[PDB]
Symmetry: C3
Subunit: 548 residues, 3 copies
């Protein structure tokens, strides 16, 4: 009054419904009741503040601005400044303690949020305001900036009790060298971590308990002092089913990842180690998948394995199925071309352009396929059936030429207990053929015991008459076989040089077995001198086959 | 009265531009025109409500709060309470029917949003307010909570006509046991589903039509009654190019995934089945990739395959290239070590620490590489050229020792139509050498037909004279070959035991072929008794080579 | 003027603290100072506008609406209309130039944002308002719509200097056919691109410099005129460590991806080419991973390789470890079954249901494993040790039958410098056995030089007496060997047909070596006629072994 509007509360006045006056601070209040005689400066019953968002409406929706302000709540709602100077830890904590906030903590649109004290997320996840490059340009636009010089953070993790989300985040530690300040603690059971950039800290990601259903992707993890990702697993729960994809570890003083204990069934792919002092370290790595790794340079170390498994025979069952690039000091115990050890191999299948190989932890056996053919780690190559119960022989087929139409002809071999052959075929005359590796067997009267081949031995029956005979228990037979008798050493083991002439006679299995069915138990060799008298060589060879 | 501000409309007054009065409800209006005589209680032409966000400005931008309220719109804008009690289905529908809303439906920051009626998304995608763990703690902070006890949802899907996005979402069905309430229907063509947690429901994800360009990742799918993901494909369009990564299926009464029909070119990786009653089931699985699976325990079943393909020879072309962990009843038809069947194999390549194998659906053939060597499923191993047209022989090289420098010496074999040899070398004297598997061929006058090896047979020419000769059509030759004659059976097939002495004579291909060029068609064998008289054995063997 | 509220500034009046009056435009101002005599129409010192959000409070937080409006800032804050008509480029630029905005540029909830001029993102990333299907329905709800008919955009990229984020975005170019308008330029070092849909444009994604730590996933890239993704790398920095997953390239006039130069250590998986005119093209592709590709139809081309590498021997070290589906004209140079070339193979390991193979770029060698066995590209298969220094022989073991318990019996072979054998065993009599490939060696007086096998030759000592002897430098020995003498050609090279009878005598290495220890240097062959007189064959064979 008169030429401006201003009226303060007057205890003599009765204010009607909708009457407006000013509080002593100048803010306008509106009476919501008839006959209002209450002083709004001490009692707001029957009054509302007109500048409150509960009294402001969006006519598009016919709701209050108060309701619209529930759409997105951030740390800015709780007084966070994000100004690169002011400690926002209390505001972050108030956010996490509030009944109004959702599953995650959110940053405001723009801000470098300083934290000088530990924040207990109380099970809330963490969502930032962008996943930036490792530069001041991005830190100034949007990040969490933990004050590593703060005495209350020394030896501690900046965020504890994180929920199942860390995403869309840039977070650094400033002035924390030597202070062992780690960034965030998150439980290993059920996590999605994606699109993060972490800078400095001791341990960047501290996994609590053990991995299970833990997914981690698209992370730039720079300058950690101890580890990018650390999992102590103090109760030895055994980590499983963790995925680690698209991670760039750069210029860390320690390792990329440290598991103090055991990891099973985890997957690692498209990982970069650039100037780290260690790759992935674990006690036990079992049935894990490893894809592409790019390992280039070491910070201060001279030589490090990209994967370091400390337990004896504790690296096994793995799939090393991406190329591992090694430059500037990195080594590998998983290459297909690596020679096997008798024990403590990094067990698994290894597949890359280097080779296709497979090895177990506790044995020398290793097979490798290369463009040239095959290599073995134990000087042995087995060929058998997939079924352990099948006891048939194998047949090998091999291209040896063409048939008359010009198509490839694959010839079949034979390798049974009784026969070794390699098939062939004459397409001119249309006849099968074969090449033979016969049984060879030598008689020598100077042997302490008779030589035996496959259940046959040679014995003297009488002067000039020798039996190539079956020993007890040999029930196998010769069927239509080939027979060659070798050269005699006469008179002594050295031989005199005199000769002799041989003939043979078959030994039947039953009466008529040979005559009628070309089945024989064995055969006799008869030796005679130039006067056709029976004579005894000191030593002689025979060669024969058990089939045609 | 003059001690407070309150003036209602008066029809006798002319209100100037910018004059303020109160509506009968107490809200202030401002005249926007000169000479205003319109009653704002019945006609707002020429007036504006001052408490509207269209009349409130952010001076930082010189725009109205109305404009700023277009940045993010959620179901809260349409009256959703998210209070764990109130049915918000009408508010969700209003959101989807609004001209103001964008591609997706969004939840507000905090809320447990109850739905008691089906929501038609009208092509909008769905974005939640967090991907939480499977616990009341997260449901209370942020989720959709479908009332499965609602009669209007029995046997139906809660959300229909979903757009190409489902993300950042926690959704449960409460009190829906036995009511067959499914969560969401989404078209198979062009989808991105990521970072979701779904709890209960009959089918959690209902795919409409068939997959193509369908990407699904980072999902915790717990307690489904029938399937985590169901694709009927009623028109048999054939699903393709679907990706399924980082999915944790736990404690479902049915399967993880059910395809009633056919799936081609899809990828499955880092999947967990924990206490399910079934894995992935399909009619046909063709040219799909399968990576790491962790399969642990069954809910009520005793034995289930992790992958179940029902069609005969309908599992083929696949890549089973991650380790499949099997615990507590899970089985597999895809292990590298599994024996092949004559038909209905789960066709594909299988690569893990268990082995490297390859098999087709409709045939017994299967090759397996292990640390020890090789195993075959059909008792056969072929060795040939990659080209089907090449008809040269192969050469196998094998390490047999060292050369004089101490380097590995790989010796070469020979396997042609006419020669079987294994090479060697003497590095002391610097001479090549070889081991031989000769052709063997036996004459027997008791044979019904002459024995033939590779186009050669033995025939009697005259008393004591035999030709080892080429049959009609055999145009192959012996070049500088080795010849051994075997032992004679005289007088009868059994043999008398008398002997005989042999000599040979070559059979030339043309005049001088042997004498000048060591080429022969064959050779004659001459047999004589101890008086040097020509004599006829009943049966005898020869062994010879076609090369030196 | 008593029946409404309106008072303008009066220079005669002294306004107390909290007094309210109207500016000449009608907006209310409140005095913040005592004794206020300043005209708020020309000087706002000592006054505040009551309709400003700095003067509106959310009592839930006790903060101003101004603070809450810092939670999310979009292009709408800078006057963008998103109305499908108005050019918003100036608003987008103002956003990027503002001190108030964070790491990324954001779109408002709903809008089709027209851009007629280039926007310089100034290092900000780009976040849209949804990743939609390729349809007007989604463009109308939320997208960037670049006006390709704008002369100022011809031959240019619409967005330059993008930060490390492109996500949640739909962007099209309208009316740009032939105008070479590209969408966005982003640096190759440190990027996360995900959940995007791009429609038309010349190059959709223009990578500046070279890839490193570049992650790209979940993209629908339709109708590009030249390339979905283009990387010039003008300085030949060499691209590395880029990931390209879940990309659907459809109906482009050019290629999916074009690298003008070199790519190392990159990963490509779950990619679709549908009616493109080219796949991935690069100069050099080194140590890259390729997973599943679905290649179906060409737009106007007749035949195209899914991967096209132009440099000679510049495709090497790769992993082709997913199935590549080829339909409607697409071809491949990476199939396991493809025959090798002598040079310019697409080098790498290839693993799918088609086969398991490995090949290098610059050599014919290629090994392939199939269900049937093995195939080689160079007519050769090697078998050796993984270690290059090991010089022992190998032993091959092969199933040939069963032992007496019915278990598989694997027999061992022998292949040394001196011995070729295949083992067997008689489980009836419990005796080992063997099949033999002996050394064969022929004497021929018509040879210009003696035949030598493995350091042994045959020489005439005297009439009828021949030495099978070691040549100079052969220090190897026969130990308990088998000896077979072959058939004599008498009188001439052709032979007369007369015979002869042989005997042998060993040649010792030292006195008693044979007699006592069965060690020999060689052996003599003695030939005699039917009168027992020494005689000289023209030619004869021997066969012997160096071991028993």
């Amino acid at each position: 009054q008169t030429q401006y509007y201003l009226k303060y509360f007057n205890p003599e006045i009765v204010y009607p419904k909708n009457a407006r006056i000013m509080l002593d601070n100048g803010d306008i209040v509106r009476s919501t009741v008839v006959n209002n005689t209450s002083n709004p400066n001490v009692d707001m019953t029957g009054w509302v503040k007109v500048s409150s968002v509960s009294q402001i409406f969006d006519e598009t929706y016919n709701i209050t601005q108060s309701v619209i302000n529930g759409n997105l709540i951030t740390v800015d709602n709780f007084g966070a400044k994000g100004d690169g100077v002011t400690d926002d830890s209390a505001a972050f904590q108030a956010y996490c303690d509030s009944a109004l906030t959702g599953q995650n903590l959110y940053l405001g649109a723009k801000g470098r949020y300083i934290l000088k004290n530990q924040v207990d997320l109380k099970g809330k996840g963490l969502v930032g305001n962008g996943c930036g490059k490792v530069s001041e340009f991005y830190y100034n636009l949007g990040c969490i900036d933990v004050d590593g010089s703060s005495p209350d953070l020394q030896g501690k993790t900046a965020f504890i009790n994180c929920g199942p989300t860390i995403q869309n985040l840039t977070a650094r530690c400033s002035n924390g060298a030597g202070k062992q300040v780690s960034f965030i603690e998150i439980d290993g059971y059920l996590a999605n971590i994606d699109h993060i950039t972490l800078i400095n800290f001791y341990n960047q990601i501290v996994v609590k308990q053990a991995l299970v259903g833990f997914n981690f992707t698209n992370a730039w993890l720079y300058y950690s002092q101890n580890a990018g990702i650390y999992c102590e697993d103090p109760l030895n729960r055994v980590s499983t089913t963790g995925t680690f994809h698209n991670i760039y570890f750069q210029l860390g003083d320690g390792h990329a990842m440290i598991f103090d204990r055991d990891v099973h069934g985890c997957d690692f792919d498209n990982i970069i180690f650039e100037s780290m002092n260690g790759g992935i370290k674990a006690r036990t790595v079992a049935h894990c998948g490893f894809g592409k790794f790019w390992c280039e340079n070491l910070k201060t170390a001279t030589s490090k394995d990209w994967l370091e498994v400390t337990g004896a025979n504790s690296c096994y069952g793995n799939s090393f199925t991406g190329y591992v690039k090694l430059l500037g000091g990195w080594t590998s115990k998983t290459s297909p071309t690596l020679d096997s050890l008798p024990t403590n191999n990094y067990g698994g299948v290894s597949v890359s352009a280097e080779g296709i190989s497979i090895v177990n932890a506790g044995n020398k056996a290793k097979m490798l396929m290369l463009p040239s053919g095959f290599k073995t780690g134990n000087a042995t190559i087995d060929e058998t059936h997939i079924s352990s119960s099948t006891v048939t022989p194998l047949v090998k087929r091999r291209v040896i030429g063409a048939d008359s139409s010009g198509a490839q002809y694959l010839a079949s071999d034979t390798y049974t207990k009784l026969s070794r052959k390699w098939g062939t075929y004459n397409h001119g005359s249309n006849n099968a053929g074969a090449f033979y590796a016969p049984m060879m067997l030598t008689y020598d009267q100077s042997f302490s015991t008779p030589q035996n081949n496959n259940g046959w031995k040679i014995v003297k029956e009488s002067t000039g008459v020798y039996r190539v005979e079956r020993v007890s228990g040999n029930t196998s037979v010769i069927t239509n076989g080939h027979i060659v008798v070798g050269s005699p050493l006469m008179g002594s083991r050295l031989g005199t040089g005199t000769g002799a002439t041989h003939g043979i006679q078959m030994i039947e299995t039953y009466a008529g077995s040979w005559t009628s069915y070309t089945e024989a138990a064995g055969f006799k060799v008869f030796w005679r001198d130039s006067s056709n008298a029976l004579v005894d060589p000191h030593r002689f060879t025979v060669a024969f086959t058990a089939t045609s």
